[PDB]
Structure 1
């Protein structure tokens, strides 16, 4: 699969010269981080997301890795790359716009958006697991599974994004440790590169979905969301004490069933964790 070659100046024009202001005030910046900034634009009679990236040589390796992975990977639970740009000063990746933004923003109700229902959340959890399943089936390790890298389309379908740090398989080691600390598996923090780390990170995402709490909060106890698994196991608290209060359709059974999947995902011994196909099965059984 191949993609259109966009002109830098077409992208610069449709994104109002890559404006840093939010959409409400009258700007174009949508999200920042992800080794680049995502801006809003309207090209070829449609709304698009333009990622401007942004060591300069390692940044283009992340640009080339994302196109390589997208040429090879087309799925309904992955973001859709429409084209790219190299001719300008900066590097750009053009995607199909995901109107509902990131799961992180939707879980925090950024800008006053209504809280996601449990029904919506089960659908997102299932969809996200289908996207990771597709990557693992095609021998790709994401390396940065987190709620800020799961996007939501017009119908709240989960779309996995950011494949710049992706790795093939088709256990490796590296001196360049990359990812988001609060989501990373112990071995991933040590340099190991394995698809088992993606499962651990997906367990943190399932806890964010259940609780609505961010993976890391400086002004909180525990500051790291993954530590609640121990509070529940060493029966001081229970999962009901952590369920997101911003839901009226969350029954205890299905929540506990999602938590069970998260608990299994968050096993510290990488070999004890389930593979993605099992995570996928258990999430399907939860609804059904």
Structure 2
């Protein structure tokens, strides 16, 4: 990785201007700026609830994981440098933004949506094959290149029972919320993503009943077609029902009843 200067990333991102303007996005633990190094467009994630030493631990984890983990379905770290992390620029941002059509981008078709699901699952498979638990699988963390290839991101929380429960609540597994660290938690979160992919509905909505997307698993299991994202003209009952079946299996309340990433991957390939 290239050891950048904590200064050469300032003038590439126009003195860290947080407008739509040099700011693509924002999350917890930091801000994502669009920089231009050499002839390469980059994503510089300046790190900013959590303590100062805890950002450093998440900075070093990110480096350590990215050093050994290289897959076309994982974003690539180019380097780092106050703490910065420079990544390959994803021209199509996050899956969350695309599902919401943020900044007027066209709605992803079901065809692309099936390819992204397979891409994301391959990315997770590499991580689990290499004995890594992501610990924060969510559509904001599934990035998209110019060809809409799904690239999983954010390995700061990743691990090769805990006191510091961390992650996104709307996506979290019951045992994860209780502080358990198992790759089975990642499966559960991927099932939430699968539900966002089918419905175009975000995992959490303040001004919506149910507020939590995963509560539709119950709504449909009691009373699915009614939830398919209407901003699609190319979806079909069989492939939609086949993706839902995977999400339903992923969303099993009991971690041990859930399928492993290899099975999920296989089931998503059986879709096409």
The 5 Å alignment of 1:205-216 reads 205-216=193-204
Q: Residue 188 of structure 2 aligns to a residue in which SS?
A: helix
**2:25 is equivalent to residue 31 of structure 1:** yes
1:44 to partner: Cα distance? 2.0
Tell me, in whole angstroms, the C-alpha distance in 2 between the residues paired with 1:77 and 1:28.
Answer: 26
**Equivalent-residue separation in structure 2 for 1:39 and 1:10 (angstroms):** 13
How many angstroms apart in 1 are the aligned matches of 2:186 and 2:38?
A: 36
SS at match of 2:97: helix
Q: Deviations over 1:145-183 (max 9, x none)?
A: 000000000000000000000011xxxx01100000000
Structure 2: gaps spanning 5 or more residues: none
Q: Aligned equivalents of 2:170 and 2:24: distance in 1?
A: 23
**TM-score, scaled relative to structure 1:** 0.92
What CA distance in whole angstroms lies between the structure 2 residues aligned with 1:284 and 1:31?
32
Q: Report the CA distance between 1:82 and its aligned residue.
A: 0.6
RMSD: 0.8
* Pairwise CA distance, 1:37: 0.6
- Please state how far the C-alpha of 1:34 moved relative to its aligned partner: 4.1
Could you give the per-residue CA deviations for residues 44-63 of structure 1, whole angstroms, max 9, x where no partner exists? 21110000001100100000
- The SS at the match of 2:14 is coil
User: 1:190-245 CA deviation, whole Å, 9 max, x = no partner?
Assistant: 010100000000000000000000001111111100010011111xxxx1000000
3-state secondary structure, aligned to 2:62:
helix
Aligned partner of residue 35 in structure 2, secondary structure? strand
CA contact (8 A) 1:36 1:52 kept: yes
Distance 1:144 1:34 in 2: 12
Alpha-carbon distance between aligned partners in 2 of 1:80 and 1:44, rounded to the nearest angstrom: 17
Which deviations, in whole Å up to 9, do the C-alpha atoms of 1:20-41 show, x marking residues without a partner?
101xxxx111110141111001
- The answer to whether the 8 A contact 1:34-1:162 is kept is no
SS in 2 for 1:192: coil
Per the alignment, residue 39 of structure 2 pairs with 45
